[PDB]
Amino acid sequence: SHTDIKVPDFSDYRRPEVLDSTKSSKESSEARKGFSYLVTATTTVGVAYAAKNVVSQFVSSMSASADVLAMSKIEIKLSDIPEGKNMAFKWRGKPLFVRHRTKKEIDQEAAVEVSQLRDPQHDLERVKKPEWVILIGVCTHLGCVPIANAGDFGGYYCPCHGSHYDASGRIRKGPAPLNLEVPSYEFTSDDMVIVG
């Protein structure tokens, strides 16, 4: 008969908790699952730690390399530029105009008409310190290098098409759409400035 089949002894293989044939396995069920799922959960935390680092590195690869960060910023010495004169610099393959402004140039660009401008910006929001104006020396229309201390509005003038910038770098009379660009910067020691 099929009644002759009796299941082999599995005692060699069993967990200690389920060895006792006279006791209910239900006591140990909460526990036995706990142990095995802990192993699984711990594993997943370890794999997460790894994959986070692997992915994160690969992502980092695509961000700016050490040599591109090296040309990100440029230091400029403020005692090396006299009051009134412009000084050009080489920044991210562009000219960069820093200008020491006189108490005349400050007051004269302070009380200018706000509305009349093609790109309306007041002077106290174009600069961080009133006596220093920092600008990119690329003409905004079709890309030239504006010449300092010239033009109608006495600031920057371009011999390409016919643009006239004031002492604050704002377009007054010409074909340029948006003023000369104000970069990101901060003064560190009152003698030095970092642009970038």
């Binding site: 590195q57 690969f58 980092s60 690869s61 695509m62 961000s63 390399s65 050490a66 040599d67 591109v68």
Partner: protein, 378 residues
Amino acid sequence: TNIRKSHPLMKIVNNAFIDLPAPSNISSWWNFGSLLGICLILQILTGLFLAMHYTSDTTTAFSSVTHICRDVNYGWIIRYMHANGASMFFICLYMHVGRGLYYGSYTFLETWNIGVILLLTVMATAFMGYVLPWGQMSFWGATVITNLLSAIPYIGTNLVEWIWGGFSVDKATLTRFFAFHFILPFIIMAIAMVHLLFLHETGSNNPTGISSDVDKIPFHPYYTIKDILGALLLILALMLLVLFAPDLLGDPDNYTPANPLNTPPHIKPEWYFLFAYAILRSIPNKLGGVLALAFSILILALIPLLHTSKQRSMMFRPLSQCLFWALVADLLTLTWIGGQPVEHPYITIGQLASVLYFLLILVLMPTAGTIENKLLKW
């Protein structure tokens, strides 16, 4: 009823990777297929990320690779993963092939032949990869190996200058080697899918060489969990090299830029070609040497035809077992000899090893099969 068996895309994945009936008894030597796939993906990713920073112009090439290692964020760990990943690839390949030989998996003819194609494509990829850094061994390795094709009569000399795109390995050669090197892994991926497509016509062989239809288990969870463990161990081997000895399996001469005047002392390809490089140098005649180097790989295509034994696996076959392990030890000797200068006693050892390689495959292991048969009254 489920959307694993119903959905046109999930159906393919459910049948190849989950409900696939696999033999209960397959050993660790069956992990290498899984691992070769991982190697391939690994190379593609690391490779693609390197290609974002590399340039194939002869002047800037060496510099770009170093720029990766020194300035690109974690560019070093990417670069050395890719170079040691190529070693891990070839380790995985030869283990994978050895399994096939020992257990007679090559009786799956289509699977086997596509294998040979895959092998040859991975070789072509890795040959052209090693050129890209444009160091000494890169340049001089490429020069000697390419120039072997000039030994073909009538056309050989044209053929060499056509690959080169000029009169030596220079500007046009490096740029095209970058192009071919990029595209080939993708071609491999496709051929690898055809490889499996034929494998799943028959299902897997096992260590006994006896049909396993009476004892198949589903691939998931049994072999999905094994493959995870295998992948884990593969990452250990790779990262052990990358983080503790990244220069171990390479050559120093590839850290000085390529010089068309200054020849390196003992020019040689990377370790995984050395066995076949030794076979080339055994034969004194150059065209003979090329035909031997060619036949040292293509002989893989011949193996199925050479099978004599009435049993499939070498499991139950002592004579074959010994001759197999002799063939392995011989290949290890050819790799050693391939790395050496052309002198005594490395010439004679190399000749003797090369004779033994072809002798084992073409004569001794076939005879051994037939001896074994007649010992079993077969």
